[PDB]
C-alpha cells in the first residue's frame, strides 16, 4: 500500500524494487559570437513621443522604429560556448512532494489518508503549511536562508531492479526508450509508434524494446504520473523535470526540418525560472532564452 510503503522506508528496507532520478541543474556560461561582415539589415526610423500627460508634463519619450532581416542564404554569423561560471541551481538533495497538488482520488478510508497527510508533509522544504484551497497554488514556504543556490527537484520513477547498469552509463532517455521527434522517418505514424507501440524494438537500444515498462508503455505508472494530458500537478508550481519527457503532444508537436531545429537550440524558452527559490514552473509572463539540448 502507499501507507505500508511510507512505513517501510523510514525504517529502511528495500521494498522489492528501485527507482530513477531525473533533475535539472542550470549553468550560466559566457558564449562567444563570431560574425560575418555583411549579414544583417537593421534599418532606422524616426523619434517622437508626446504621450499622455501624467501630471507636471508627460515628460517626452521619443521611440524609434527599426527592423531587420536575415540578409544571407546560409548559416551566417554563428556562436560558441566556452566557460562554466557557477552552477546556479545547486546540486541538491531536495525530493519531490506529490501532496503539493490535487491530482488523485484519495483513500476511501478517510481515517488512513489524513494520518498519511501530515506523515509525508511533516517538514519538507517543499511542504506547505495551511494546505490546498479550491483554486490557487500551494505556496511553498520560504526558509530563512539560502546558501549554495536555487534548489533542485528530485523526482522519482519506479524501476525494476533487474536492468543493466550499462544503460545509464550513457546519455540515454530516462524513460527507457527513445522518444524524441528526431528518429522518425516522416511516414506520418511512426512518431507515436516508437513512443508506445512496443511491438518494435527501441530505436536507441534495439536488442530490447524498453528499459522500464512501468515507465514506458501507455497507462503505465510512469505514464500515469507525468503526462501532460492527465495533469496531476498543475496546481503546484514546482517544475517537473519529467514534464519535458512525458508529453504525448509536445514532442509530436515539433517539426523535423533540420534547418529550424538547430536554431531553436540557440534560443529556446525553458520551463524553469532563474528568479525563484525552487524551480518554479515558468510564469506565463516572462522570457528566459535558454539553450537546452535535452
Amino acid at each position: 500500500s502507499p501507507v505500508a510503503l511510507y512505513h517501510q522506508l523510514k525504517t529502511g528496507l528495500h521494498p522489492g524494487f528501485g527507482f530513477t532520478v531525473v533533475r535539472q541543474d542550470r549553468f550560466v556560461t559566457e558564449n562567444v559570437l563570431f560574425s560575418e561582415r555583411a549579414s544583417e539589415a537593421y534599418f532606422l526610423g524616426q523619434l517622437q513621443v508626446a504621450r499622455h500627460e501624467t501630471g507636471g508634463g508627460v515628460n517626452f519619450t521619443l521611440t524609434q522604429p527599426r527592423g531587420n532581416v536575415d540578409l544571407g542564404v546560409g548559416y551566417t554569423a554563428v556562436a560558441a560556448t566556452g566557460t562554466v561560471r557557477n552552477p546556479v541551481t545547486d546540486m541538491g538533495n531536495l525530493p519531490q512532494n506529490f501532496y503539493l497538488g490535487r491530482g488523485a482520488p484519495p483513500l476511501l478510508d478517510n481515517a488512513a489518508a489524513v494520518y498519511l497527510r501530515n506523515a509525508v508533509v511533516a517538514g519538507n522544504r517543499l511542504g506547505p503549511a495551511q494546505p490546498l484551497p479550491v483554486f490557487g497554488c500551494a505556496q511553498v514556504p520560504r526558509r530563512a536562508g539560502m546558501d549554495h543556490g536555487q534548489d533542485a527537484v528530485c523526482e522519482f520513477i519506479a524501476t525494476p531492479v533487474a536492468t543493466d547498469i550499462n544503460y545509464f552509463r550513457r546519455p540515454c532517455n530516462p524513460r527507457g526508450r527513445a522518444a524524441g521527434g528526431v528518429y522518425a522517418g516522416d511516414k506520418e505514424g511512426d512518431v507515436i509508434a516508437l513512443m508506445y507501440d512496443h511491438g518494435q524494438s527501441d530505436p536507441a537500444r534495439p536488442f530490447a524494446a524498453t528499459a522500464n515498462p512501468w515507465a514506458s508503455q501507455r497507462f503505465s505508472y510512469g505514464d500515469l504520473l507525468y503526462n501532460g494530458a492527465y495533469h496531476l500537478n498543475g496546481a503546484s508550481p514546482v517544475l517537473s523535470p519529467c514534464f519535458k519527457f512525458f508529453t504525448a503532444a509536445d514532442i509530436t508537436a515539433k517539426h523535423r526540418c533540420l534547418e529550424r531545429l538547430i536554431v531553436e537550440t540557440g534560443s529556446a524558452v525553458s520551463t524553469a525560472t532563474a528568479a525563484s527559490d525552487v524551480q518554479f514552473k515558468r510564469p506565463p509572463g516572462c522570457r528566459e532564452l535558454v539553450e537546452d539540448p535535452c
Partner: protein
C-alpha cells in the same frame, strides 16, 4: 478636474489626524447630532427604542457641540471598536493598541456600546459616517481641527506622489491585515475594485458590527451575488444586512503589499494609486 480639495472643520475629539498617519481612510459624521429620533422610528416595537437616546449621548460625553460639529471619523475608530465584535481577536485588537496609545478607548468604549445599540433598533451604521477621503493635510490647531482630506474622484491618490519627491505620501493603508479581505484567490491580472461592506449578524451575535474592505475585479452587478456567496453570517431569519458602497478603483493589482510597520506594531497594507469613485450605498436584504 483630476485635482480637487475639500475641507471640513470639526473637533479632534474624533480622529485626531495628528495622531493618525498621512494615509487614513477617513469617514465624515454626517447627521452628527442625529439619532434620538430615528432610534424611535424605523424599528419594530420589540426593540425598546430608549437605548440610542442615551447611547450616542454617552459618546459625546467622551467625544456641547458649539460651532465645531462632531465629525471626521477615522478608519481606526471602527476597526478597533468592532475588533471585539467580528471574527478576529488579538489581531484586530492590535488596532486598539494603535488607538488608545495615540488617539483613546474612552471614546471607543462609548462607541462600542453604540455599535451594539445602533444596530439594535435597526439604525444601521451605513448612510451615517459617509465617505470623505484620504487625509491630505492636517492644518488643525491644538485641540480643534481643520483638515483637508479630499473627496471627488481619482485625484486624492494622484496628488500623493507629486507633493513629496522622496518615497510616497498617503499610499493608502488598509490599517489591518485582517482588513483588506483577500477575496478572489482565483488570481488573475487586471485592476482592483474597492468597496466598503458592513457585514451584520442580527440577534445571533447580538447585533454584530464589521468594517473591512473587499478586493475584487468585479462589477456592482457581479458583487451582489458575490455578497450572497462566501458568507457564513446568513443565519438571521431581521433583514437588510451587508450594505456596501464603492470605495473606487485601484487601477492596478500589482501594487498591493504586506507590512506590519506604521506610525505599536500593527499589520498594514500599502495600496498605491487609486481612482476614488465615491459610489453609492445599497441595503435591502
Amino acid at each position: 478636474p483630476r485635482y480637487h480639495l475639500t475641507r471640513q472643520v470639526t473637533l479632534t475629539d474624533l480622529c485626531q489626524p495628528n495622531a493618525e498617519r498621512a494615509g487614513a481612510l477617513l469617514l465624515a459624521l454626517r447627521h452628527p447630532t442625529d439619532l434620538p429620533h430615528l432610534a424611535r422610528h424605523r424599528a419594530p416595537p420589540g426593540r425598546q427604542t430608549e437605548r440610542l437616546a442615551e447611547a450616542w449621548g454617552q459618546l459625546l460625553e467622551a467625544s456641547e457641540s458649539g460651532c465645531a460639529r462632531a465629525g471626521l471619523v477615522s478608519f481606526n475608530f471602527l476597526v478597533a471598536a468592532c475588533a471585539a465584535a467580528y471574527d478576529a481577536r488579538d489581531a484586530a485588537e492590535a488596532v486598539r493598541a494603535h488607538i488608545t496609545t495615540n488617539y483613546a478607548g474612552a471614546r471607543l468604549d462609548r462607541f462600542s456600546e453604540c455599535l451594539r445599540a445602533m444596530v439594535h433598533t435597526h439604525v444601521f451604521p451605513h448612510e451615517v459616517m459617509r465617505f470623505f477621503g484620504g487625509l491630505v493635510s492636517w492644518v488643525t490647531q491644538d485641540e480643534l481641527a481643520s483638515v483637508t482630506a479630499v473627496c471627488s474622484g481619482p485625484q486624492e491618490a494622484t496628488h500623493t506622489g507629486h507633493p513629496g519627491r522622496p518615497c510616497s505620501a498617503v499610499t493608502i493603508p488598509a490599517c489591518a491585515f485582517v482588513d483588506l479581505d483577500a477575496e478572489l484567490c482565483l488570481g488573475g491580472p487586471g485592476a482592483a475594485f474597492l468597496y466598503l461592506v458592513f457585514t451584520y449578524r442580527q440577534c445571533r451575535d447580538q447585533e454584530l458590527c464589521c468594517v473591512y474592505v473587499v478586493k475584487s475585479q468585479l462589477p456592482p452587478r457581479g458583487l451582489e451575488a458575490a455578497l450572497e456567496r462566501l458568507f457564513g453570517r446568513l443565519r438571521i431569519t431581521t433583514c437588510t444586512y451587508a450594505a456596501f458602497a464603492e470605495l473606487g478603483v485601484m487601477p492596478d493589482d500589482s501594487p498591493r503589499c504586506l507590512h506590519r510597520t506604521e506610525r505599536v506594531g500593527v499589520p498594514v497594507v500599502i495600496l498605491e494609486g487609486v481612482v476614488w469613485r465615491p459610489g453609492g450605498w445599497r441595503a435591502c436584504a
